[PDB]
Amino acid sequence: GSMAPLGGAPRLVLLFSGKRKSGKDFVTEALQSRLGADVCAVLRLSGPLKEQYAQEHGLNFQYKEAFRKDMIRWGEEKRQADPGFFCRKIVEGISQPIWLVSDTRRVSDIQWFREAYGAVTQTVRVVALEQSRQQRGWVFTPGVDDAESECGLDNFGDFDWVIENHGVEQRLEEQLENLIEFIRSRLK
């Protein structure tokens, strides 16, 4: 109904996604660095996932990683009945004009943001050449690389922008500079 009661009203919301070891964090941190924390905020859906999970289980706050799977299964159950369950929590009290959601992973995350903020939402997919992922130590891992957390957007192609990481620092910098100038056009 009222989709995000605690959310501000950004001039631009960038929805990032990308498989592990592809350079997504490199991209999002570079953008926030160039823009400044007061201009750009980085929001992580994993934040409320951890906070709410632990909470509804006898908590406090924000072998030891099979628990990660527990949280994922728990989060999926919440998300299936309430797509915006975690989205509503990351946008609360964010006063910066630019929002960078660094970890959308499912189509529902994109659909929720496009419906709630429509006019100012832009989706950006980070993809890396396979050898670049290999250099990072990536090896196909059953239970991870074939799980929804990593493949939820594999059949989605309606991204606004796609950053292909070629494993070359200069090439990625150029892409970052292009994106930064796009973001800046929204702060005028």
Swiss-Prot record:
Effect of K64E: In POROK1; uncertain significance
Thylakoid keyword on record: no
Chief location of this protein within or outside the cell: cytoplasm
Gene Ontology MF annotations: ATP binding; phosphomevalonate kinase activity
Annotated phenotype, changing R133M: Approximately 3-fold decrease in Vmax for MgATP and R-MVP. Approximately 5-fold increase in KM for MgATP and no change in KM for R-MVP
Tissue expression from the record: Heart, liver, skeletal muscle, kidney, and pancreas. Lower level in brain, placenta and lung.
Outcome after substituting R79M: Approximately 10-fold decrease in Vmax for MgATP and R-MVP. Approximately 3-fold increase in KM for MgATP and 50-fold increase in KM for R-MVP
Domain of life per record: Eukaryota
Catalysis performed (reactions): (R)-5-phosphomevalonate + ATP = (R)-5-diphosphomevalonate + ADP
CC annotations in GO: cytosol; extracellular exosome; membrane; peroxisome
Effect of K21M: Approximately 9-fold decrease in Vmax for MgATP and R-MVP. Approximately 10-fold increase in KM for MgATP and R-MVP
Family matches, as Gene3D superfamilies: P-loop containing nucleotide triphosphate hydrolases
Top enzyme class: transferase
Phenotype for R136M: Approximately 15-fold decrease in Vmax for MgATP and R-MVP. Approximately 50-fold increase in KM for MgATP and approximately 7-fold in KM for R-MVP
Keywords noted in UniProt: ATP-binding, Cholesterol biosynthesis, Cholesterol metabolism, Cytoplasm, Disease variant, Kinase, Lipid biosynthesis, Lipid metabolism, Nucleotide-binding, Steroid biosynthesis, Steroid metabolism, Sterol biosynthesis, Sterol metabolism, Transferase
Effect on the protein of changing D25N: Approximately 7-fold decrease in Vmax for MgATP and R-MVP. Approximately 10-fold increase in KM for MgATP and 5-fold increase in KM for R-MVP
Impact when changing K64M: Approximately 500-fold decrease in Vmax for MgATP and R-MVP. Approximately 3-fold increase in KM for MgATP and R-MVP
Binding positions (substrate): N165
Biological processes, Gene Ontology terms: cholesterol biosynthetic process; isopentenyl diphosphate biosynthetic process, mevalonate pathway; response to cholesterol; sterol biosynthetic process
Induction (record text): By sterol.
Pathway of action: Isoprenoid biosynthesis; isopentenyl diphosphate biosynthesis via mevalonate pathway; isopentenyl diphosphate from (R)-mevalonate: step 2/3
Disease implicated: Porokeratosis 1, multiple types: A form of porokeratosis, a disorder of faulty keratinization characterized by one or more atrophic patches surrounded by a distinctive hyperkeratotic ridgelike border called the cornoid lamella. The keratotic lesions can progress to overt cutaneous neoplasms, typically squamous cell carcinomas. Multiple clinical variants of porokeratosis are recognized, including porokeratosis of Mibelli, linear porokeratosis, disseminated superficial actinic porokeratosis, palmoplantar porokeratosis, and punctate porokeratosis.
Subunit: Monomer.
Protein name: Phosphomevalonate kinase
Originating species: Homo sapiens (Human)
